[PDB]
Design a protein around this ligand. Sequence first.
Ligand SMILES: Cc1cc2nc3c(=O)[nH]c(=O)nc-3n(C[C@H](O)[C@H](O)[C@H](O)COP(=O)(O)O)c2cc1C
Ligand SMILES: Cc1cc2nc3c(=O)[nH]c(=O)nc-3n(C[C@H](O)[C@H](O)[C@H](O)COP(=O)(O)O)c2cc1C
Ligand SMILES: Cc1cc2nc3c(=O)[nH]c(=O)nc-3n(C[C@H](O)[C@H](O)[C@H](O)COP(=O)(O)O)c2cc1C
Ligand SMILES: Cc1cc2nc3c(=O)[nH]c(=O)nc-3n(C[C@H](O)[C@H](O)[C@H](O)COP(=O)(O)O)c2cc1C
Ligand SMILES: CCC(CO)(CO)CO
Ligand SMILES: CCC(CO)(CO)CO
Ligand SMILES: [Cl-]
Ligand SMILES: [Cl-]
Ligand SMILES: [Cl-]
Ligand SMILES: [Cl-]
Ligand SMILES: [Cl-]
Ligand SMILES: [Y+3]
Ligand SMILES: [Y+3]
Ligand SMILES: [Y+3]
Ligand SMILES: [Y+3]
Ligand SMILES: [Y+3]
Ligand SMILES: [Y+3]
Ligand SMILES: [Y+3]
Lengths: 356, 356, 356, 356
Amino acid sequence: GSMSLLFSPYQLGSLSLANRLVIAPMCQYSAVDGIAQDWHLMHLGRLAISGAGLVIVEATGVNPEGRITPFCLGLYNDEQEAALGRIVAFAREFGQAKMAIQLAHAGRKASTRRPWDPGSPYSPEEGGWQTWAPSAIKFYEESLTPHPMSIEDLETVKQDFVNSAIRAERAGFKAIELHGAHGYLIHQFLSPLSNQRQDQYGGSLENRMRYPLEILSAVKHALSAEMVVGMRISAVDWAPGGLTIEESITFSQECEKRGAGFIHVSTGGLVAHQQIPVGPGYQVEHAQAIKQNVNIPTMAVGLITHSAQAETILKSEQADMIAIARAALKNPHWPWTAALELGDKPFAPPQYQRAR
Amino acid sequence: GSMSLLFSPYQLGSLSLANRLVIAPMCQYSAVDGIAQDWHLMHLGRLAISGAGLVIVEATGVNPEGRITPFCLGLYNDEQEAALGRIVAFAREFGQAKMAIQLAHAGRKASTRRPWDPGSPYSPEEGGWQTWAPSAIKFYEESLTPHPMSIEDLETVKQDFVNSAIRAERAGFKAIELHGAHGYLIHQFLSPLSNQRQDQYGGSLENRMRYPLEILSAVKHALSAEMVVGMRISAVDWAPGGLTIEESITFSQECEKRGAGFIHVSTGGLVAHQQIPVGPGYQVEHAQAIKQNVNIPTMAVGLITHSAQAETILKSEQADMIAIARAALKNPHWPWTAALELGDKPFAPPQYQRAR
Amino acid sequence: GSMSLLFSPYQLGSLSLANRLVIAPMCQYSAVDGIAQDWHLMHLGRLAISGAGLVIVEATGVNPEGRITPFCLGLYNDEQEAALGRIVAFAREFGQAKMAIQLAHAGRKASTRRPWDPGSPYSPEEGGWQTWAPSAIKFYEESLTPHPMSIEDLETVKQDFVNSAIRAERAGFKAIELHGAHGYLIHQFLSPLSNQRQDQYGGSLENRMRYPLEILSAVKHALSAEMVVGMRISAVDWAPGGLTIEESITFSQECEKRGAGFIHVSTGGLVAHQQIPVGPGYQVEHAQAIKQNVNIPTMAVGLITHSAQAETILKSEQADMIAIARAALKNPHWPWTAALELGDKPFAPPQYQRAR
Amino acid sequence: GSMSLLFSPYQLGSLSLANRLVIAPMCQYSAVDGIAQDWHLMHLGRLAISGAGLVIVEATGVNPEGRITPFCLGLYNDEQEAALGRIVAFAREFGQAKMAIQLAHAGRKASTRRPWDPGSPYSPEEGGWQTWAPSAIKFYEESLTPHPMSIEDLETVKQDFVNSAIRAERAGFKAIELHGAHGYLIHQFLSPLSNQRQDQYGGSLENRMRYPLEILSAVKHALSAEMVVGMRISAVDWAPGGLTIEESITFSQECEKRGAGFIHVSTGGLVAHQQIPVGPGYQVEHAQAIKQNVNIPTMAVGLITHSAQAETILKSEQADMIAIARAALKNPHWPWTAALELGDKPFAPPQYQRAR
Ligand SMILES: Cc1cc2nc3c(=O)[nH]c(=O)nc-3n(C[C@H](O)[C@H](O)[C@H](O)COP(=O)(O)O)c2cc1C
Ligand SMILES: Cc1cc2nc3c(=O)[nH]c(=O)nc-3n(C[C@H](O)[C@H](O)[C@H](O)COP(=O)(O)O)c2cc1C
Ligand SMILES: Cc1cc2nc3c(=O)[nH]c(=O)nc-3n(C[C@H](O)[C@H](O)[C@H](O)COP(=O)(O)O)c2cc1C
Ligand SMILES: Cc1cc2nc3c(=O)[nH]c(=O)nc-3n(C[C@H](O)[C@H](O)[C@H](O)COP(=O)(O)O)c2cc1C
Ligand SMILES: CCC(CO)(CO)CO
Ligand SMILES: CCC(CO)(CO)CO
Ligand SMILES: [Cl-]
Ligand SMILES: [Cl-]
Ligand SMILES: [Cl-]
Ligand SMILES: [Cl-]
Ligand SMILES: [Cl-]
Ligand SMILES: [Y+3]
Ligand SMILES: [Y+3]
Ligand SMILES: [Y+3]
Ligand SMILES: [Y+3]
Ligand SMILES: [Y+3]
Ligand SMILES: [Y+3]
Ligand SMILES: [Y+3]
């Protein structure tokens, strides 16, 4: 690349990327017992040949109770690892995208239904399960009060993150994103609205960061040095008394000190009474606040739908990388059109080059 | 549908379609021994969820020597049939498209390379094969002169079409398109530039139509009556002394009498010295000529790239159905954008409805 | 031009046009006593530099009572002629469009309000006037029954058309379009729903065509031979018992025999109880019916909004020229984008070439 | 407006604007003796009905020698004022834009040719004139060395700015933009590359700002209090030893103290050996630097071509208003399309509402 920043090659730690465009993680709710299915090969295989330099696989539960739904991906046994490795192998052969995976634990937001099947969370008798959380504070008022995690629970989930990370590297993923955003377990520890613990893992900012930073360090220590481990954050909670940009800056700096390779900057998701001023680029200001206070790449996301918008965000130095989600659902070849509009050569596998 | 013709439900014989939009067949050159691969599940699965009412699988050889390349799909053994049936099953579960397959024999254009691997056709020592044709007339001057087919050769290929058709119906395909276009075997019989036979299968128009009409009747007789069997034609050869629109009208009328369910109207492909006046809708006039002389649905194709162009073709009654190929490679969700521009509700699988 | 038909130079009679794109006439309702104002210089000057090869000025009344509204253009005195000549001179200096004007008489549809001021027609005491028509049959039930025109009335209006044509030629217009469409005076004579006369100007088709053909012949005879005089028609009435495409074909053939230079093919407008199947290219079929039966250029119009749609209409030979109206109101530089989409050089005046 | 910031009503000093979209000044080189012509009515009248809330008329010379070219607008006599007043009156009748004018003196860049007539500046005997500048330093090496301005020259040109401002207010303009950018006279004083004076108007930053700040204060004092007077700046020179963003921040703050109503942030234009990193939004970072240090509205400009890009600039608080130029030449109804893409009601005069 030469004409635009968006499609110029970029170095993410030890990982050489074809460009600065990222496909954000998007849950598909199409797995069986956490095992990726034909849908994921069709869905992720398309994103891998889209032209983006990095594709982040949807939130993947580190243990059965960490899945958002009974239909989410998991990475806690050999059968799930083999299915994901097959998809990574397809991406290696046909696309120019590096494959990353988002390791997650849904915390108090687990055991829920597909978004297109509205209703209350699955009760244990309906095939659901009781959730875990830093504190016994509910997100869904209609379901069971979450189990407050003991010190041994913290070590169990942390080891599950480590084991899922080791499986991911073995399956061929070149980067890992820890899901500390959108109201799931790590975010639940970070924010005072959900963390009311009275030990050293709740209260002050340093206490609320303590367990998420342990997970990051433990994951980084269990992987080879060339593996990239990043953190997706919710920089603010959009609710009174929640996470502030100053605290998220501090957390992002602490993540960098422990070897995080990038910060993926999102917002919201912690409480139902949030008020989010949704609009084009409504989270770009938060990405710029993070980028100006860390020395690792920052990914912006949120209603980024046009190449000229994406390139301005990079050129004006609001972020280092552009992530898109819904624009890629509408047009999975968004990078093709975007590269042409910016004057760069679009990527296309040989099978598709008669349309180029 | 209610706002446009393009996205109003349509009946193709006994086959109820969600709309009048067709994805034209597009060779992928990604098979192994004729067996569909992961690429085809990714490629065809996406087209099946695109919103189109009908997806026509790429040209599939009825026997090993009928493949265009060593990397084309085949439908002459159980392993190939099972792999295609798996893709059809994916379409039945997630998409609203009916699945069709184009049964083909490449004739004198067989045993060639991938289009992105330029070079001469594969010689027999390179893993290629000598081709079959109605007459010993070469398309590629650098390769072997094709073997002119005897009467028993005609019956062998005809039975191969029948067997592939039976396999296709068993694999779940609801429609079959016989490939009588683009310079392959059936087209080679139809045109005087390639058919110089001295028996009852060459010479007059009725002789040149005789063998293609036999294949159609044999295929239609070997399948259940609710199966749709259509014919893709090259209405003209774009070369002096070749097929004329009057002859293609006659052949299309003869196809209807034999039970053909639709006519898919393309042009060209027979000889290398063709001069094609390519441009937006350059084959639509040929589709209107066929439509005005037959009582079965006519599909138009050829540089149809915009919804307003497609809808005008239907409203002005130049054709009954719209086929797209390259526009679907560039944007596999073309029907999504097209439906919105025409004021109709776009189709999207539930996994993607948060982008709708 | 060389890449598309739409932007290839075209010969309209003795007029050499830059392309085949026409801006259809569009009433602006912004005149004072029929005199063009600053609005018309802003509006028509923009259309003249748009890139279209031909701009047709809105329906211009040949006498005060022939105006649709008190705010319509007129061409029956020196002050109106001078104002229009100033606009034609602006077009000559900056644009590549030839200037045409639509000469009209509203007949029984005259003396009405601006479309954005809904209400009954202006009564004579409100500043309106009683209308003239072939028969005493109302379009608006709330207004005065129109005067049925006597023999001297026919001669008077015909002479008004002649005088306006002479003024138009003197002001610099290179083509004239007679408004025989959309339910106005000439159309009122053509259709049996509005013409119930008992003399030689009503009854048979030959009688209903008689007065419109006299106007055409008289206009053609009064102008220099290189002036182009065309006819805009309503090919059908979209009402039971109205004009048929067969009758409009005959009238269009009679127009050519009198020296008409083109047929502009529209539909509707005669009666309020019409049912029009509106949609993209819904009048293109009617244009093709006329084009196949005359040897003068045919202009298609009606929801033509995209370059690929326009080029398909020309390439498939449904019409000889493409007319647009509402697409040019939405984007007055529609030809700029259209030429780029078709691969041709877009026209731009030197003041705007830093955007090219 | 309510759905987007770009099309929400905005307060610019005492001026109520329909939205936050600005049409940037664009020289047309179509005047005669500084008098606006039919071209300017066509061009500026279209911009006034485009939907933008503010239209800035092209750089207008405060005296004959301050014009960039012999074909630029001037505002130093009654005939020029009356012609501009007739355009403002057209805008007031049909559009929703408030009208502003850019008052300028080209300094050492005066007496040049139309951009589409490349060549050396007009010499005095060819109808050109010798230029004035803070120092006898040439921009064009082929022309006469500019006159270094004496104390009376400063007072004379300052009075010319005052007189033109009074004429502009009398002609109906509601805002004035002083042209302190793009290498013209005021910019020539600000930058050390062009200002080498040894008196109190050169040397230190305080000295280089002294004369531009006098012009602003004198213009502000001669107008009514409700008139808006802004400053267009070149925030950096893109050349070694030129203006820095720190210096432009200081100048912008000094402008605010003396009553400037807004800062319009551009860059470059001072020296020919500049190297500008052109790209989408390449001047937005400079606008944000100004916005973060002043309490008056800041306008961003420079390759802003898409609504999502423009809205992101506002929502992420890089600027308060969006200015477009070349995008408005390509599509003068850019605000119409932009409002629809952002979900707001587009503005259209009643004559055009049948296209909405
Ligand atoms: C269908 C869907 C699934 C998503 N799943 C995830 C997820 O698993 N993990 C995550 O961090 N974000 C998820 N998100 C949020 C996106 O990653 C992204 O942050 C959000 O959609 C805003 O970006 P966009 O406007 O480009 O879509 C999902 C979004 C959608 C629409
Ligand atoms: C990559 C590619 C593969 C194709 N393979 C086939 C094929 O197997 N059988 C066939 O009948 N046409 C084939 N075609 C031709 C298309 O079906 C279609 O008729 C042609 O591309 C014109 O349509 P379009 O302009 O919409 O692309 C292929 C076209 C492309 C671009
Ligand atoms: C505002 C407006 C004014 C029009 N005025 C005229 C007219 O004066 N004479 C005429 O023959 N048609 C007139 N028409 C009809 C158009 O010329 C054209 O035939 C019709 O709008 C369909 O074309 P389109 O879909 O491209 O707009 C007008 C249409 C509009 C929207
Ligand atoms: C034809 C043309 C004329 C221009 N004239 C002026 C001018 O008179 N005064 C000025 O400050 N900028 C002028 N400019 C610069 C623009 O105002 C604007 O700052 C620049 O084009 C970048 O914005 P854009 O990318 O939206 O076009 C002109 C630009 C163009 C293309
Ligand atoms: C036939 C009467 C009339 C024509 O409209 C005479 O010119 C009235 O203006
Ligand atoms: C200083 C002389 C001059 C510069 O503009 C002003 O009078 C000449 O017009
Ligand atoms: Cl293990
Ligand atoms: Cl999520
Ligand atoms: Cl083919
Ligand atoms: Cl009309
Ligand atoms: Cl300038
Ligand atoms: Y323990
Ligand atoms: Y920087
Ligand atoms: Y019909
Ligand atoms: Y009379
Ligand atoms: Y022809
Ligand atoms: Y002096
Ligand atoms: Y703020």
